[PDB]
Ligand binder design. Structure first.
Ligand SMILES: Nc1ncnc2c1ncn2[C@@H]1O[C@H](CSCC[C@H](N)C(=O)O)[C@@H](O)[C@H]1O
Ligand SMILES: Nc1ncnc2c1ncn2[C@@H]1O[C@H](CSCC[C@H](N)C(=O)O)[C@@H](O)[C@H]1O
Ligand SMILES: [Mg+2]
Ligand SMILES: [Mg+2]
Lengths: 250, 250
């Protein structure tokens, strides 16, 4: 292992807290608080302390996508839509740091207040789930100041990290990036997924990667297929674990 | 920063848990449980979760000693006597890993049971302190299995980590190492300090480093000066923080 490989390996173990192995919140299918290795490996629990919930397999995928973009010269920035405590974006900034990339930015997009209240404008699948009801139960609302604090703890808060605070329907249409190499979608709902596919995906470079964290959620999957059908996109959907998928844009 | 620099910086922040900032035990001079940056920076608190209590200044010192030994070709292994949860030894193994050193071992020596019960044979200053009284209060007893588990969480449990379980009086005289480049002493008491100086210091290479973690403790300091006087050692004692010192062997 090289210095770069050791750093990024440790960074994944740290943002997912394989190091200290924090308890999970009890919610959904998780009925016990105990840390379970298999659950954290595949991002299936609700960490009380860890900076990301996506798990090792999805962290490895993020690494693969960013490294492939760098290797193949795919132009553009990295955007995550739905960041919680910021761990996946911290890792993305770390990847760029490890390779001394100074001309790409990590865009950190969130409401910074959890899921929105449902209204009559919402998709029926989103309204039925009503993910807003779980905001407190899994400690979802996390302020911009707290996320910035978290970046600083790893020594990774700098001018190649830019924040996009607000609802995706407000922030995405005129977000000030020109091109993306990796677009990581992690907002759970039909609405959040469709917001970002509509308004950010057209800026994803050929050869860039589109990651859908929440493909196991029917509402998210619905938006993915509606959007792909609308635009005639047939790029192979590849599974990462039991929840997430990605495709590479041809 | 290079990959090695990034890895070692993160490893120090992780073993001391500047990342998640765990509470301290309320013991000694510490009257509040809250994480205090300045206390963790100088290793002055009693972490509830972190893998080392030595703090950032003493971690930096250990890095300096190991890197200097490597740079100057000082032969030998690294030994820590008194390891608690193993974080300082984990860091030492990480330094060797970062520089792809394959021919040096980190020796991890502890009772794995905390401080010993005081007997009539103990030095009077050790009987007066009775450090055994504090074992449970700061969660000191940490089994060999737990320490091995901790190494494995960082991906650093391999055949270049060797364990010496037992009281130093019993393990040091015939410990199987031949030469040391760094001898890190962290047992607090006159007895632990004298046992290790007596039985391990003669194997410290010229140009090697002797670190005394607990030099602020009068009983420890007495052993240090008694030993140095007996052996005619006049190498400069260099202060690290409010607790620790080191010298480099002529
Ligand atoms: N319509 C919307 N606009 C902006 N943010 C939203 C949103 N719907 C949900 N979110 C945010 O989406 C996130 C879902 S959880 C994200 C997990 C994170 N990627 C990790 O690494 O663990 C939450 O932070 C929530 O506040
Ligand atoms: N005589 C003796 N023999 C063996 N181990 C001893 C000892 N006296 C104390 N110890 C051990 O010395 C350690 C003191 S605390 C060590 C702190 C550790 N270096 C860190 O990085 O935080 C304890 O783990 C205790 O079990
Ligand atoms: Mg998700
Ligand atoms: Mg000590």
């Amino acid at each position: 292992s090289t210095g770069v490989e050791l750093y990024l390996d440790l960074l994944k173990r740290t943002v997912s807290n394989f190091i200290y192995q924090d308890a999970t919140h009890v919610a959904g299918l998780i009925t016990q608080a105990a840390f379970v290795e298999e659950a954290r490996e595949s991002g299936e629990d609700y960490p009380t302390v860890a900076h990301t919930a996506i798990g090792m397999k999805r962290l490895n995928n993020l690494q693969h996508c960013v490294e492939s973009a760098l290797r193949d010269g795919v132009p553009g920035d990295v955007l995550e839509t739905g960041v919680w405590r910021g761990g996946a974006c911290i890792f993305a900034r770390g990847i760029l740091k490890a390779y001394d990339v100074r001309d790409r930015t990590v865009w950190v997009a969130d409401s910074f207040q959890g899921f929105p209240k449902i209204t009559d404008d919402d998709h029926p699948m989103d309204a039925e789930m009503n993910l807003h009801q779980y905001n407190a139960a899994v400690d979802l609302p996390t302020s911009l100041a707290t996320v910035q604090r978290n970046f600083s703890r790893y020594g990774l808060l700098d001018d190649q990290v830019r924040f996009l605070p607000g609802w995706f329907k407000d922030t995405m249409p005129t977000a000030p990036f020109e091109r993306l190499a990796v677009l990581r979608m992690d907002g759970d709902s039909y609405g959040a997924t469709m917001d970002v596919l509509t308004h950010a995906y057209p800026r994803l470079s050929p050869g860039g990667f589109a990651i859908i964290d929440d493909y196991c959620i029917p509402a998210c999957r619905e938006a993915v297929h509606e959007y792909r059908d609308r635009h005639g996109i047939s790029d192979e959907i590849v599974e990462i674990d039991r929840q997430g998928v990605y495709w590479r844009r041809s």
